[PDB]
Amino acid sequence: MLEVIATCLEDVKRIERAGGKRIELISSYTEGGLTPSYAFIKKAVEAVQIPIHVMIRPHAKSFTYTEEEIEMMKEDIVVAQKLGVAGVVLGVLNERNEVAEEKLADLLSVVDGINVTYHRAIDDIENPVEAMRTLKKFHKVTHVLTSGGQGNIVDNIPVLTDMQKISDGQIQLVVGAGVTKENIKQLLNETGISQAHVGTAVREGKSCFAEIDLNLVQELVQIIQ
Last residue before each break in the chain (C–N > 2.5 Å)? none
Q: Which of the listed partners (Ca ion, a copy of itself, none) does 133 bind, with a CB threshold of 5 to 8 Å by partner kind?
A: none
Q: Which residues contact 141 (CB under 8 A, 6 or more apart)?
A: 108, 116, 117, 118, 135, 171
Ligand-binding annotation for 123, yes or no, is no
| Partner that binds at residue 43, options a copy of itself, Ca ion, none, CB closer than 5 to 8 Å by kind | a copy of itself
106 near Ca ion (CB under 5 A)? yes
Of residues 179 through 218, those in contact with a copy of itself by CB under 8 A are 209-210
Q: Is there a binding annotation on residue 71?
A: yes
Region from 7-15, 100-108, 124-132, 151-159 binding Ca ion, contact rule CB under 5 A: 100-108
> In whole angstroms, how far apart are CA 43 and each of 73, 78, 140, 203?
20, 16, 26, 22
- Counting residues that bind a copy of itself (by CB under 8 A) gives 34
Draw the binding track, 16-55, toward a copy of itself (x: CB under 8 A; -: no contact). Answer: -----------xx-xx--xxxxxxx-xx---x--------
Residue choice 3, 16, 24, 76 for contact with a copy of itself (CB under 8 A): 76
79 is in an annotated binding site: no
Closer residue to Ca ion, CB minimum distance, 20 or 149: 20
Task: Give the interface segment with a copy of itself, choosing from 8-16, 89-97, 117-125, 165-173 (CB under 8 A).
Answer: 8-16
Residue 212 sits in the site that holds Ca ion (CB under 5 A): no
Which residues form the interface with a copy of itself (CB under 8 A)?
A: 7-10, 27-28, 30-31, 34-40, 42-43, 47, 58-61, 66, 68-69, 71-76, 79, 209-210
